[model samples]
Target: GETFEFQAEITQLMSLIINTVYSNKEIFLRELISNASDALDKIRYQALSDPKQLETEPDLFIRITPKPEEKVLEIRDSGIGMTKAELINNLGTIAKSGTKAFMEALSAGADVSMIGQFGVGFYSLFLVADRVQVISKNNEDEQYIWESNAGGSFTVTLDEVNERIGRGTVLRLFLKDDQLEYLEEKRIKEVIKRHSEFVAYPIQLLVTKVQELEELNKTKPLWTRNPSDITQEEYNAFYKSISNDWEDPLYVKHFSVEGQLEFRAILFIPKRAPFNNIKLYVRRVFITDEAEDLIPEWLSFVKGVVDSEDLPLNLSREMLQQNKIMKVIRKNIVKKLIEAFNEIAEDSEQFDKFYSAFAKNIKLGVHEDTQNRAALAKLLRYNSTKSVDELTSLTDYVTRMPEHQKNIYYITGESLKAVEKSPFLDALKAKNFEVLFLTDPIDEYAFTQLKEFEGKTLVDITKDFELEETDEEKAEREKEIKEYEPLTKALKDILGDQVEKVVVSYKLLDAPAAIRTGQFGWSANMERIMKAQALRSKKTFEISPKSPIIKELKKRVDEGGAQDKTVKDLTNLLFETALLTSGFSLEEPTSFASRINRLISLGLNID
Candidate 1:
């Protein structure tokens, strides 16, 4: 055995790790397990080129045996062990993540958070131990041992005591009396599994009393491998384990990223959406499953894993908050998720099935994420005037728009039947202009916020009522407005503040009159939604100038019958009928009923 003095940098840095006050003292084990995986990965990589590198111990794994009574903890890994010279240099310095400037800043003050960031995990064994003994064997060198006292010096020698290690490194720590908890079997299992359960190599915990080596890390990430190498059955198996649904996933999105951020993910669109199941991993180890910050709530429907090594953990490494890095992952996740839906979209039949289940999720995305509106909009589908209960996209609608059609029109209501029969869509339907029929509660908020797509504004037909009027048609509308002002004025007078304003409609094809509201105002569907929340809770009137009913009513008013009760009754029916057909709940359906009864009696020559 030969004694060696600590480097000037190491002597100070060792005390910094030992005495530095980090609340998460458990990361000492985490860092060691992570580094152990690195070594195993290195050996695995070397063995690919030189098969003899792992000739002695073909299996690469980590074994932990904790002895509380003896106040000692042992960690052994079948990995690329270091030579005597390699041990002296590698174990003496801070190598990765940060540099010399980091140690100086840490030494200047008791900066504790920098330990995990600086890759000084090897020295962290001092946090709970007074001494550490490292016995290692490499393919090119003889077995050797390096011992540290967490002081100014250490010792190195040829391994003579434990020579049966074959090929690897073993860590034996004599724990401090107060830190004996590190040696407890139950405590060791909890810490090691929590920190390195998904590590590349298997981790086995020696259950001393039970006389068995219990495998701790059980996860084999199929997502990290190439998609071509993965089997469909394996993907389904992974899906079931992560999600609550027993049935297979409707769609799976296994993807890797090396772009703006480096990450890999396996997302699925289930037959029915799940509550929330996303496991976040660093390198290969499971960090957390709540993954609340890793995926957007709008995308909570997907059950999967988000693996990223680029993320920086906060002080404790137990929680990942809304750090900007994770926010980027979420953004990328959504982009990938929406694009995955494109494959579904290409197959319209398959997409409709998927859309039926999670349309609201993508709709919510449209309402919430300003950055992804265009992409999210493409995933949107709704029943339109052009089909027999078939769904269509805004893209399809835009392509079909005639040359003169300038807007992407849509209408939202209670159901397909309701919107199909709505007076709001009569002109659009009659003009052969397709209007999207949006029935879901979210459709109101979603379509409204989308505003425009591919340079064409999304117009709510009920709000921005329009048609390409010819000059002759415009002149007729103008002359009609001049003469029908009396009727609109009289209707406005009768309704009072019940209506916002009254105007002449040149394009009301089927209805006598229709209700219109401000372009930026709450949609009728929005009003319907608010009423649903509490179990209970129309600004313009456009009377068709071309309709015989409206024209006949105008004559009655102009011929001095405007004051007559009969003319008044007919006008009231038109206004009330317009209100009901335009998707507004009637203030008094009983009045409507009475009016219908009276109108029928008059038609039968009884009034």
Candidate 2:
């Protein structure tokens, strides 16, 4: 027996394997089975070029035997095995450079359909087994046994008992006291079916009392089949198998892109998204189902599989960055998915069902994916002043726009009721302009990203909205502004830095006063949201001396000095009234109440 010390990286890798690589110890069975599958793939691929490599086992498969009485578990594969040097190099160390070289070799036209280049995944056996013995025999070398308790060292020696291992690898795991569950044939079969049912090979198991060898994995790779040949029932059954949801998918897009970078995909828009969505596969081997990056987060609601012959397998999820082909695949999926959406968008029944579940996610997609911005914009639906329950699209809004109207108007608040109550919409409604009401919090942020759609500028009706008026109306409005000049001057003198300047309400129809910010300032709703986030102290929130708007108002205050006490009272009352209408909280509610009571008594002639 030749004893060797574990590599520094191997020690750390072992620690991670037992501690963090997988929270469920049951996955160790998957890792071992996957490694066996890779060995089989390697041998099967090599036999294509060299027929002599298949002499030991013409047929390839994995066999699992559990010895509960002996408290041991054995996993054997009739595939390419390891020699002494290979066992040392592949198992004794966990080197990233070695893995990179192996990957390069695989990618450099090598006739090897292999996985598990990470190498360290084998050590995950320690999660379930206290001691492990690997017996392997390669075609070109003598049979060898590698045994390790994983206590800083291991031993390698010639295999005398299992002399040849029949040109394959066998792992005999000495079960830990708490890991006897792995020594049960039923438990082993359950683990295999759960994680490796579609592993592309037969996983056979034989128990002691049971005579017959049972084949555990039976599902075929239906995604690789021709779309036209596959029946709808088969597709629905496959969806049910992958997804636990009982309802069938609302729509399915199945096609393969065959070229320099080849891949086949089957994407489905579900009736409603469940917990598990996207499934990623490489060379028909299942990689992961929880990879959020396989599709964008905006399409997390989409459930499907993207199987590629071009994607490099064995890269851990953490190391799997989006490469050039991955980006292309993502783009194609998104483009095709949007095309499917457009086809169904005209059908109000289907589109309504889709929107009811994923409308917010689509809005987020509009905010996130700028390249698909216009496509997502067409899918957006919002309530208009003309219809509260009916949703309208931007294209429809633009289609119905009057010839003279240049801007698309929208108003945002906490709800439809809140937006409909805004005094700012009065002028738009009077001019017969349909205004979109945005109630969702995400709706406002979406507008921040989508400033314009289809050559029309999105204007917030609550802000300064420039609308064309008749010549007589313009002249009359101009005279009204002139008439209010004295009152504006007095209010400016009284309010000082509280406002930019007092002006006659051009857009206001019934309200006595209203508040509006500068072109770039936050909306009253946005301001309320910001303050509610505990963004600053109350003292800081109460003052804005250096604000550009406040600076201009201070200049106006200096211009109109020596303000009257009565003007000061009226100014404070007007400011508070404006704040009430603009969705701001009163800093001094009692003061506002007393001032309003005094004004009410005066107006009633009740001195």
Candidate 3:
């Protein structure tokens, strides 16, 4: 008898994987079956290259059995079996996660996805079982049994409890007293169907039916066919088949190309992000989508396939890290995807429905895909000065820019409704300015990267640039700024470092005061986006408060001896309104509410 040993760190890694990385415990069976299925694929390809390599014949299907007498659940597969030495090396050490490798292969032309991209190998087995035993018979060597408690070390020895078959691997999970649910056949089949259904080979699960029948995986590879042959009904059926989704895809792009690169791709913009779309696959094998190699992180809402003939195959059946080719392919697929959306927006009303569900991704594209910035900018929809609450595009706004206007104007707020009510829109709307309304968090990242569109610059109206584009408007704005100079000066004094400058707001309508930043400071939307990236780099940020121009304007209004009390009420009203328009949540919501209540009270006063 012999026992196997593991390195000190292997146990630590296994612990981390079982505890932190395996989001779902049921995935262990999927992992094991995938490993088995991979072995079968490897050998079949090998036999294709060398027919006589397999000494004894083996079939490729999962055989499941319950050993109630011994409290064990065994899963066996007639796939490529590993030798004892190979087992120790593969199991004892962490193979560099093949995520990068799978990505490169897929980019380079691999047909399917492999599961190691998630990087939870070796330890995924610990998800369900307290102890695991693998007994394997390989054509290159003798029969061997490897055992482990998964604490630190394990033992490998010869076990002769059963007769040796051809070349295959058997995995036995010693069920902890509470881990008995996995022993149920229907439950196990459901798990297989859920995660491993798209696997190319037949996953025949050994089931104890009335007559001891097995349920072979019957999933068709809908992605492998021509897009024209696939009906909308077929697309919906396949989406449901893979994701168990009730709503059909908002948009579908089925494609095949034959020029320099040869590949087939079928992509779906699900009515919504799947409960899990962050997934990557190699040659129909699943890795981790967590790496973001399959789709751009911003575009993770998409669900689809990009099958290439050039991807390289891995022999050991473990995940690898991403590579350069993966990046290239990722770029290609995402670029085409953005183009697809743009076309939808132009070609069909259907794209509007799709865009409604996926515009956040478009906003992200503005920030993340630098090369496609202008193109994506065109797809951006906003509620403008003339559009009311209806959506309009950046292109539409550009087309409607006042003849003398030099920039595309915009303002940020907590929501579309909030911005629609902004006082910043008053003068601009009266002057026929088109103001793009930004509401999504990613909109911040996008406009930052997309500094300008077409020949015009992008300017946020909340910033202190002169709002007048024509000579007549410029002179009129100058008189207003001058007339309220004293009040603006007083506002600067009342609010110190909180503001850079306080000025009479040309854009102000019913409101008396509004705060503006220097042209370079981050917009309220951009600042919110940066601050909310909880997992990103560490950096402290604080935005300068109300401008001195606003401060001065407040003082002029106060000293006018206007006893009406309307000046004080509406002036304070103006400053707070500016804050709301700039994307900052009111710090003194209670005080603001009190002021609002007072104004409402005045509305009912007998005076």
Candidate 4:
């Protein structure tokens, strides 16, 4: 036996791995098992070049033996072992540059189940152990043991105590006093199941008391199997195992793609959302569960697994940002999901539940995933003027459209009841034109992106109420505007800059006044919401300053100064009435109340 000092960097790297590399000490077991899986992958891939290499230990698997009483935990793999020189190079050194070269060498047509991407995962073993012994036996080299105390030095020597390990590698951990939980059979089995259950190899646990070998992993990945062969019970079982949900999934979509970017996926719509749901696997080895990019944020409610052979096993996550294969994979998944939702929409009762659970998210998809905006919009449902109790789709609304209707009208507000009562919908109702009641807060944000559907522009009824009228009716409207001019001017003079302009509204029939925003300005509903939210600056309510009524009001306000209390009272009353009718809560209810009280007294001549 000969002792050797680790390079300065290796010592530092090992220290970091043991102390700071992983947040959970149990991750040490996962890292070691991942390395063992990688070793098997390299040997299996090497067998493709030389068929004779598979003759030694043809059945590949990983074995775990824990002895809590004895304070020992061992993980052994029947895969490629290391030579005396490899033990020193791969185990002793940090191997930063060597890992990339090693990956490139194994890249070509490798049937690999590899996971050792960082090259430092092996040192994670010291997180739970004070000393470690690696007994490795390669076909070309005799058995050797590499020992380390995690104190910046290690020794490699011929194995003289234990019998020869036929082929592959064995890791023996001399458990630290605080980490003896890892040496319990039950604890070791739980860690193996959590991290390595779906791993492509059979992970066997040897318990001495029971004299039994229990396989802790599911050898075949569920996503890799044919959809036809997999049963509903099996699918539910897998989903529950991964997602920890007790209820059955709302929807299950199992599919496999064999084209440019090959992958197999089984995505499920959970009964509810806000769960950490998706698990991404590269070659049946778990990579990450929080691969948010796997699907759009809207689809975060979806739970499942995606296994792709096309993704480079060693591809850094940063590199995955613009990986061409990933883009294609994501595109296919979204397309399939949209199609599935469309099918669900056919069943009214079922679709009702689906939409109720994820309607906001679907609207979010319409706003963010522009590539699939049209598809997401097709799944939209709302209560309209014609379909008050029932939800109606845009397609149905188009089919039910009356002749000469030019645009799809919608009004967004706090509730269906509130939107239905909006004064802005008066003209549309008088004309018997349907107005979709977009009641959800997210609806406006989505409608901003979904500006049009099926060639018809989506017009906010609140913004502009345009209706066709006969020549006689047009003349009457003009006459009304001319007659109301003096009253409009008086209201504007009183209100100052509170409104855009006071004009005869052809859209309003019963209500005396209603407020409207500029074509591009925030709606009253939006303005109310923004003001209510904390961390907002003062906002300006706009009216066209150049309009005749606005100009007249400015002159009157400049002249009146402190002499127009009557005018100011009328302005407050008119403004409050408009705000209440337009679904906007008044900023100062006290002022509005006083104005109403004074007006009531003046009308009744009581004071």
Model 4 over residues 33-145: C-alpha lDDT tens digits? 87788788777877888977778788898998887777888889998888898888887777442344567775567544456655676777888898998999998998999
What TM-score does candidate 4 get on C-alpha atoms? 0.76
lDDT of each: 0.77, 0.74, 0.67, 0.76
Q: What TM-score does each of the candidates earn?
A: 0.72, 0.69, 0.63, 0.76
Task: Write the residue-wise lDDT of candidate 1 on 1-607 in tens digits.
Answer: 9999865576666566678735567767887887677677667767877999889999888998787667778899987888887677677555443322333543353312222354555777788888988888888899998898988777888988785677888999888888888776777877765666566678888887657898876646676689889887888877775554799988889888886686788887788866437777766656667666667878787877777767776543555666678767777787777788888888867887899889889899899888878888988888887864677778888899998888888888888888888876778766788888888999988877888898898888877466787788788778868988888888887878878888887657778888876676777678868877865514788878877898788888878876788877777787777767777778768988998887689899994
Top lDDT prediction, candidate number: 1
RMSD for each of the candidates? 7.7, 8.7, 10.0, 7.3
What value does the lDDT take at residue 462 in candidate 3?
66
**Candidate structures ordered by lDDT, highest first:** 1, 4, 2, 3
Candidate 3's C-alpha runs over 4 A off are 1-191, 194-196, 199-206, 212-214, 256-265, 275-290, 305-315, 321-323, 346-349, 467-499, 502-510, 522-607
Rank the models by TM-score, top first: 4, 1, 2, 3
Worst 10 residues of 3 by lDDT: 537-546
Query: Which candidate number would show the highest TM-score if scored against the true structure?
Result: 4
Indicate the residue-level lDDT of 545 in model 3.
22
Clash count of each predicted structure: 0, 0, 66, 1
Worst 10 residues of 2 by lDDT: 537-546
